[PDB]
Design a protein around this ligand. Structure first.
Ligand SMILES: Nc1ncnc2c1ncn2[C@@H]1O[C@H](COP(=O)(O)OP(=O)(O)O)[C@@H](O)[C@H]1O
Ligand SMILES: [Mg+2]
Length: 276
């Protein structure tokens, strides 16, 4: 597909930089015609076929296609897309309260209620995505945004659809590898991937929410990956002594090497720690 090729600056003004990654930069912006605000994600295009710099057009279009499908309170939506010779520019719903990553850094240790208030929202967004056969493949705290960080129980949206894929056969077997501390063993081992990989990441996020510590993190990325593949984690008493056994059970049933034995998103919502 092709996108709008008028100069995005004729239609929008940009402001604060909201975040970035290796091939993307995200700027707050305001649409001239409405005064409404958005997050403009500029993704750097590849300059040749054989290049490793920038993002392939196939990969950009996959992100756009998935984003166009989705509408749920706990996911961002896509407003418009522009392009020019250097970038594709996705005009995304603005999430103005910063990353979960930054919230957790700034705040004291969470209560079990605060952790489940965040988790339940994540679960609801993932339930929506998985119902659509969309695997996110990059769930982690920098990819979850708060609407407003100055309320007791902040509301969240999942962002960053740059690794998301439609799973129409039950698994996919493309080049997909995210961040060592969050990826499932099947990613580490270069196996076909499906919705189950997201459920593993949710286990890792839950462990972080409750404890402030990352379950598999080693001193190097190779150590982290080796730990993931071996399922080398434990609940440290120093961090988990006043956390319930049911919360640990929830995590334990997600951090399972065999994807067939791991809780599904439906299972997670019916688990006794979560189910009303
Ligand atoms: N819709 C959004 N609203 C607010 N900030 C955003 C939004 N999308 C992305 N960001 C910020 O920009 C960062 C990078 O965007 P992201 O989509 O995660 O791209 P990357 O694939 O490069 O990680 C995010 O971690 C977040 O800080
Ligand atoms: Mg990201």
């Amino acid at each position: 597909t092709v996108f709008r090729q008028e100069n995005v600056d004729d239609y929008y003004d940009t402001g604060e930089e909201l975040g970035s990654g290796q091939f993307a930069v995200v700027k707050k912006c305001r649409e001239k015609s409405t005064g409404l605000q958005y997050a403009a994600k500029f993704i750097k295009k590849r300059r040749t076929k054989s290049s490793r710099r920038g993002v392939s057009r196939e990969d950009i279009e996959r992100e756009v296609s998935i984003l166009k499908e989705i509408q749920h309170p706990n996911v961002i939506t896509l407003h418009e897309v522009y392009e020019n010779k250097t970038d594709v520019i996705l005009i995304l719903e603005l999430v103005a309260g910063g990353e979960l990553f930054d919230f957790l850094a700034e705040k004291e240790s969470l209560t079990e209620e605060e952790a489940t208030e965040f988790l339940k929202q994540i679960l609801n967004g993932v339930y929506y995505l998985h119902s659509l056969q969309i695997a996110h493949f990059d769930l982690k705290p920098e990819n979850i945004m708060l609407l407003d960080r100055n309320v007791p129980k902040p509301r969240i949206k999942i962002i960053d659809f740059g690794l998301a894929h439609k799973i129409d056969f039950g698994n996919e077997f493309k080049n997909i590898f995210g961040t060592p501390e969050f990826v499932a063993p099947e990613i580490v081992n270069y196996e076909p991937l499906g919705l189950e990989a997201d459920m593993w990441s949710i286990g890792v996020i839950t462990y972080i929410l409750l404890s402030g510590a990352s379950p598999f993190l080693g001193d190097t990325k190779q150590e982290t990956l080796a730990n993931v593949s071996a399922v080398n984690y434990e609940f440290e008493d120093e961090y988990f002594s006043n956390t319930s056994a049911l919360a640990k059970d929830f995590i334990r049933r997600l951090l399972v090497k065999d994807p067939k034995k791991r809780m599904t998103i439906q299972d997670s919502l019916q688990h006794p720690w979560i189910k009303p």
